[model samples]
Target: NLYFQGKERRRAVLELLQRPGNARCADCGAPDPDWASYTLGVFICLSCSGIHRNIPQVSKVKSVRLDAWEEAQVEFMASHGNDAARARFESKVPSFYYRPTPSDCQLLREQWIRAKYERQEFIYPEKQEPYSAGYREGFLWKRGRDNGQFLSRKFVLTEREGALKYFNRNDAKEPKAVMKIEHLNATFQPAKIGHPHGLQVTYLKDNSTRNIFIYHEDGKEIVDWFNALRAARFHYLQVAFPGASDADLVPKLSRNYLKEGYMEKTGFRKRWFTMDDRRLMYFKDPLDAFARGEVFIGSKESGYTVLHGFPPSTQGHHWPHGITIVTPDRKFLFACETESDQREWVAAFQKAVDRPM
Candidate 1:
């Protein structure tokens, strides 16, 4: 259902993309669509379009495997080549839908391809982590480094369980990834003594005393620990079809699920007498939840953090947090979101949390 006004809107968007330096696919670095071609639904070049359409579709929603390191890959096809290559391929490849669908999953997969392409061309993780006066060091450096704004990044909730396991954006229109198949969640485990960078993260709850050490210098040990927990604790995600995955979806689900399910299974139910009171006191209010440590889901406004790549872009802030969860083993620490619907988010969050832990 295309809207009539959206024609001009689309034109405006394309016009912006068509600007001198903006005329290229952010993911593939392909040339921007010409006026005539873009009008006909030709955004990416033929070759790039072919790759977009052929994204893999799984038989069921993708499940996250904490033990399995799902090998995520990104690809970069040549932008320009022989005339025969461009001439031979012509077909309609739909742009991503942003919600539930196989297309959504493909879009998320494409980003990995895009990220890999970017990594090969630009980003380098093995370099010195430059220090600056900022709240976080990785992805949100630009915010503090340049403007001195308080930046944070954290996951929020959207939908969960059934076919709609995802986190909603600030606008709440598009859904993002929550879980996937065969993704092994990583855990902070014990390592041998004298291992490089043997600095360990202490477990808060320990019935038995165990020696643990962190490894690696240059600030990678804690990073690995966080990644391991994220991967191991919330690895099994239920990926939706035909759309992209949001990074924070799994955490939001885990937090909310633990809050409710643990209480339920252990027979420690919410002591409130009515649903309205629970919503009014805890579920609906950020202040109430945060004070009580019951804020399982948060909004972008709440200060969830994110960590991004090298040298860090010291510019305007895309988000507030200092870190982002890049992968199971990598993270960017920031703040959590501020405003979100506790009931709605908890419902969605429980979807992913209900899976085998």
Candidate 2:
């Protein structure tokens, strides 16, 4: 019997998992990861491992439990775990660049892995022009508001102007819309857009929420634009609030919707409801860029409260579970398809209601 055969080598690698910075995924920060990219010398989760698998030239992944490990590979991981790899690969990651979480979509998590190990963008910082540069001009497919069709539109984001503008025609002298960076928000909605690379751009027009659906056939292009928008917002906020810290301003770059799905209002059909910060926006169709109506949800200190059941006189609802939101001005009635749905919506509303405003 070999003194250090399969059992000994496997035992060495398993101990590495208990080390500092190895307990959670290196890329998405998921808990208790069991996959290791031996080539890159980093521990990641199964979901992140699939992404690393695609970049064979830069990384190779193996299971910590099932796969056989050699002495050399086990020593490599023990010597250079996640913390050391992150210090080398992610040293210069710009604050504006989105560090994806497990909850983020595939494209974001994929690009983050590629940027760190595959392209080494953060290490060099020179290849970040696609998103870091002040001005970005590209063509993206914009869904028509009324026609339900997509058309090629020229979009421009200018940090100098502090606005993202899109033209109705390429040669047109005037932009159809000029969205201010301060009011702009960019979020991905793949299923709603019916495309993997879909991006939902939301902005304020006269104090009301306005949304635009856009995408690029290329994954990198769409992801780049999303970051460029964040970059624009970052610079604008820096100048807008001179004394604010990076921690304070970075979160304002972009935000995903808290909870979004179809919920029934007592008087209306099943409407797509989106709880973004304090605004409860409803849309007739999930794909619509225009909101049918908007409701402001203030904190409990401001006379706002959420209840599980509806008012006694309410009727004509198909769904059984109910939610009632009382505001200073009026009360909004809503119903959920399932009891779990009602609980989820109630919890989300309670969060905003209990916030300090």
Candidate 3:
């Protein structure tokens, strides 16, 4: 009674197409499609197939009736069909982003398709996990090429409160790589260099460079992994500044190279700086400096009022990037490494000081 055998693959595909909505185009819902995307395993009308063809290597369109079908392709169609692919692509999409009706503008329809397959704009959540949730874990297949042959290895990826751990072997007690989500930046690398589906992640760790690359056979899944890492990053930042809205804690100066404005009254000492609405803080080192004990610009016991102006002539001559901060009790002359840095700090403080009395 089972149908997906070698010769039965075609019959199974026909059965899938016969199932109500499966026969219609996945994009426009037009009836009786001759074309399909073998990669995503979704049926599409000719008009939609034309759009699919434009998505570079992401979309693999094939003629279901005319093209010589591979058994693997037929199995992929049977597994994903229309419903599963629709759910994966359209799960978190907003109503305004997707307009699939015939009456809708062609631009809108094309945007939806491009967003779904290319950008994958709607496939992942926009925010991070909750602090109370503790942590999470999952399994994903990691791709590795050996002797010019690509092979897959399973990895257990765990998300702690603020860090991520990846185990190469299931039996291994220690993780192969551990990355702090806050210090991580991830980007997609197409299947051109070595990995067909690759993600390049760079981590800023202790002023040292560490690169982690994870790949999958399916390009779509690579996008999903990238989104997940981004969500984790947001979550880590939220943990750093609890109860602070994403907008309120927008880091104007993040990991910027600058001299500590007041290490010894007027000396310019090498330091890292960070600024938000609440605090302007600095540290001795660059990596994870925010987490370490930092000296704030205006302290609690010091109670130095923040005022805005250009630095004194003597100080300005020494440092062009001088920010003249005058207080009722004290005057702090902070200098940036560059004029641009000085301007940024000046603008940030100007806005901070301007925020209604």
Candidate 4:
């Protein structure tokens, strides 16, 4: 039997929501709030609930009075209810920080709560130690500033051991935000209309994009920083996942080892193969793109096999260009356009397989 039966758990959560302090909306303080943010563990009113739902992936909103309750959601609320969330997030609510009143503009109410939870505006600052070796202090716009406005703020950016973090100068005690290097995607936006030379950093959190913009008068400086960030990201990946080569980190860094080939499975088909230190990934059409499938050289415990050259029985097969790659779960047959390509692929696979796992 379950610790709390499904019906009983749902009823218990409803009773908890009706408690005195919990009855008020976490955002607007409207009476008799009926929505719950399961992840944040806060009760919200229907009006504020609409705003929370629209705030993208950051807020996990669910109907307390309507939607069917999941046991895990019930457990989350039981553990970190309205009071707990407030005590954690609103512990250091600044005097200037806006608190939504029922009379406040609906748009203003949405913006206030968005700032509270999403930007973590009113949360107590955590004391931060000096960043690691690669930290650098610089100026950059704090992401959601108006494009037409020449707004910039001081920040301390770091490419630490395995991640990237930036801290606001005004509040150096805690990092404003942090993301793993591999999750970061940086690109350069050239000087143009309504914008100067800029570095656009997109940090992917749970598959949602949070865009960070950095502007510089000197275009070269922005370009150099962009390149450094990209390099750091790739370097971190290589260090974290051993046997991941430079090509695995950055496709442009891939060499012309075995550029083009024909992979024979059901029939002969043109393909492009890319080799990283740990895996031999094959693509259908393009050279530099996401691989269709990959064969892990490191997964040898499950029986990794590689056979080269042609078979004795030659029914429906190519000779010298033939190579069979066998793994625990699947088999791949490939034929290169030239014998040289085939040999290079086998040699590459052998080299990778030989590398210390």
Runs with alpha carbons beyond 4 Å of true place in candidate 3: 1-91, 94-115, 118-162, 166-172, 175-226, 230-266, 276-317, 325-332, 337-340, 354-357
TM-score (C-alpha) between model 2 and the true structure: 0.95
Candidate 4 TM-score, C-alpha based: 0.35
Worst 10 residues of 2 by lDDT: 1-10
Candidate 1: 10-residue stretch with minimal lDDT: 58-67
Best by lDDT: 2
TM-score ranking of the models: 2, 3, 4, 1
Question: How does model 3 fare in lDDT?
Answer: 0.57
The CA lDDT at 65 in model 2 is 89
Instruction: For residue 62, give model 3's deviation from the true position in Å.
Output: 25
> What is model 3's C-alpha RMSD?
15.1
What TM-scores do the predictions have?
0.20, 0.95, 0.37, 0.35
The Cα local distance difference test for each model comes to 0.27, 0.89, 0.57, 0.61
Instruction: Mark the regions of model 4 whose C-alpha exceeds 4 Å error after superposition.
Output: 1-4, 124-357
The deviation in Å at residue 228 for candidate 3 is 1.6
- Model 3, span 1-357: residue lDDT tens: 544354576666677778776867888877887788999889988888888888858898888776767878888887887888788987875321223554434444565687677766657544223211335454544434222343344443335645666666557787766777666655443332245455556555675544455666554345445545655665566768789776543332122222223221254554555453435555443222122333234433345444333444544234445566654466666666666767667666655455543
C-alpha RMSD (angstroms) for model 1: 22.4
Give residue 186's lDDT in candidate 4 (0 to 100): 55
Residue-by-residue lDDT tens digits, candidate 4, 85-117 = 788778765322234577644444665676567
Sliding window of 10 residues with minimal summed lDDT for model 4: 124-133
